[PDB]
């Protein structure tokens, strides 16, 4: 369903002015507004400034099950970005804990994940329960009725706004996942830093720009297909500039730099990637900051 900022706009009105508005009030609630939420997530997305622990052991035991099967692949033949990682893995625990929880169908499966995800229910005046959890990424949340709020953030969000955030963070541990898959030993881990500085400077855009930030971010899909036409004429010198798709990008990026030079330095470094191959990783990731409200 779209992304609007409708619903959380209504309820934010109405609470400086139904059990999801009591736990508002009880939480002391002060919502920043929807204008101010994607510039939120740019800042947060590849922060580290919380405890990962749980991160860490996660992706500790899964590279040590896929050395298993790595293993068994051999048998038959014959570390700095690992912490950015575990944060990554972290955030994707912790937004998948209040998911489920958010989309308990009953108070029956709530009291089950909140047993399990160590969340505590109390009951609001209409009959609707309130689940409240620690997560180490986003700190206190209170859930009722599809609504999470986050007390130390001061943010409200609805089901979607959660679900876009999930995917965002779900998109990049697959980016990585992806250039780690592989039975060629295609890329070094110079070349998952170069994706990784390329989220870094995305996400400045989104931090600075809000919802308007998409704007720019959309540009990085003409960027990629112009750096793979550079690329085709490296190896075939003899195929035509296409002298007009060109000017596009550059007038396009151009202008863009003039609201947030960041495009700029998305665009440079677009441009100095090697290989088709990262190209196409970089492009595969086009959806890896998010979504506007529409």
Not at 181 to 196: G, H, K, V
């Amino acid at each position: 369903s779209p992304l609007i900022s409708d619903d959380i706009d209504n309820l934010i009105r109405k609470f400086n002015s139904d059990g999801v508005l009591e736990m508002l009030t009880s939480c002391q609630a002060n919502p920043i507004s929807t204008s101010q939420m994607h510039k939120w997530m740019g800042s947060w997305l590849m922060s580290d400034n919380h405890d990962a622990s749980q991160g860490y052991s996660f992706l500790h035991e899964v590279d040590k099950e896929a050395e298993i099967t790595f293993d068994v692949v051999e048998t038959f033949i014959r570390t700095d970005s690992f912490k950015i990682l575990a944060y990554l893995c972290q955030k994707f625990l912790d937004l998948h804990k209040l998911t489920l929880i958010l989309n308990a169908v009953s108070e029956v499966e709530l009291l089950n994940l909140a047993r399990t995800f160590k969340g505590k229910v109390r009951r609001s005046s209409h009959g609707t329960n309130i689940c409240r959890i620690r997560v180490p990424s986003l700190g206190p949340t209170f859930i009722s009725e599809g609504w999470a709020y986050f007390k130390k953030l001061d943010i409200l969000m609805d089901r979607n706004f959660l679900l876009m955030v999930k995917d965002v963070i779900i998109g990049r541990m697959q980016t990585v996942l992806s250039m780690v898959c592989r039975i060629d030993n295609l890329f070094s881990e110079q070349d998952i830093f170069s994706l990784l500085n390329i989220y870094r400077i995305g996400d400045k855009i989104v931090e600075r720009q809000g919802n308007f930030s998409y704007d720019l971010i959309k540009m990085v899909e003409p960027i990629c297909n112009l750096k793979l036409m550079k690329l085709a004429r490296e190896s075939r010198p003899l195929v035509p500039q296409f002298p007009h798709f060109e000017n596009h990008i550059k007038t396009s990026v151009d202008e863009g730099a003039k609201i947030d030079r960041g495009i700029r330095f998305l665009h440079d470094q677009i441009m100095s990637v090697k290989t088709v191959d990262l190209t196409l990783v970089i492009y595969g990731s086009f959806r890896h900051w998010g979504h506007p409200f529409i």
